[PDB]
Amino acid sequence: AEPGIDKLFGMVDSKYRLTVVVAKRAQQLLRHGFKNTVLEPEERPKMQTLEGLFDDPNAETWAMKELLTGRLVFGENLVPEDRLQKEMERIYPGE
Amino acid sequence: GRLIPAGTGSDFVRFTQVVDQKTLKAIEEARKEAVEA
Amino acid sequence: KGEDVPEPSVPESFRVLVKELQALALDVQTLDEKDNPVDIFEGLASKR
């Protein structure tokens, strides 16, 4: 199947949170390049084309790899509204 | 045509947020800007 | 562009729906949280 599908189920109380988590996470993960990635150089996803291993364009597949290391944190409340719509832009170039 | 009232469209989950260990320092970005003099 | 897809406006399904009811003389309001009309026809149909 998909990587550690069972383990990634356990991380959340409900099926759907992990879907909301993953997608939302991926959104940021492929908004700010892949500059936000709490996942090290050597543990990044890769392809095989042209005879050359190049990082996987599949945002959705990254966030899953990411959360699987527990490096993220999730909840119903963590930050305010447009008050996050500036923080991630400055720490990771929002251009 | 509205979002469905279920699944990933259930008021229960929906609002779930995600952030990273480093942007977890956004709490200390607003942490040290208050008392003056 | 490689951007992620955005969220969407109202479908003609609904818009055209309202307008049919509209046409039949039944006021069809879409109220917000505190019951204040919301603009499904963003601009366009609102007068002045």
Swiss-Prot record, chain A:
The protein's role, per its UniProt record: Promotes RNA polymerase assembly. Latches the N- and C-terminal regions of the beta' subunit thereby facilitating its interaction with the beta and alpha subunits.
UniProt GO MF annotations: DNA binding; DNA-directed RNA polymerase activity
Name recorded for this polypeptide: DNA-directed RNA polymerase subunit omega
Bridged cysteine pairs (disulfide): none
Catalytic reactions of this protein: RNA(n) + a ribonucleoside 5'-triphosphate = RNA(n+1) + diphosphate
Domain of life assignment: Bacteria
Record NCBIfam families: rpoZ
One GO term of the biological process aspect: DNA-templated transcription
Similarity field: Belongs to the RNA polymerase subunit omega family.
EC number assigned by the record: 2.7.7.6
Alphabetic keyword roster: DNA-directed RNA polymerase, Nucleotidyltransferase, Transcription, Transferase
Cellular component terms (Gene Ontology): DNA-directed RNA polymerase complex
Assembly, per entry: The RNAP catalytic core consists of 2 alpha, 1 beta, 1 beta' and 1 omega subunit. When a sigma factor is associated with the core the holoenzyme is formed, which can initiate transcription.
UniProtKB/Swiss-Prot annotation, chain B:
Signal peptide region: none
Domain of life (superkingdom): Bacteria
Oligomer status and interactors: The RNAP catalytic core consists of 2 alpha, 1 beta, 1 beta' and 1 omega subunit. When a sigma factor is associated with the core the holoenzyme is formed, which can initiate transcription.
Primary role: DNA-dependent RNA polymerase catalyzes the transcription of DNA into RNA using the four ribonucleoside triphosphates as substrates.
Record family assignment: Belongs to the RNA polymerase beta' chain family.
Protein name: DNA-directed RNA polymerase subunit beta'
Organism: Thermus thermophilus (strain ATCC 27634 / DSM 579 / HB8)
Gene that produces this protein: rpoC
Full protein stretch here: 1469 to 1505 of 1524
Curated annotation (Swiss-Prot), chain C:
Subunit structure: The RNAP catalytic core consists of 2 alpha, 1 beta, 1 beta' and 1 omega subunit. When a sigma factor is associated with the core the holoenzyme is formed, which can initiate transcription.
Family: Belongs to the RNA polymerase beta chain family.
Primary role: DNA-dependent RNA polymerase catalyzes the transcription of DNA into RNA using the four ribonucleoside triphosphates as substrates.
Protein name: DNA-directed RNA polymerase subunit beta
The species this protein was found in: Thermus thermophilus (strain ATCC 27634 / DSM 579 / HB8)
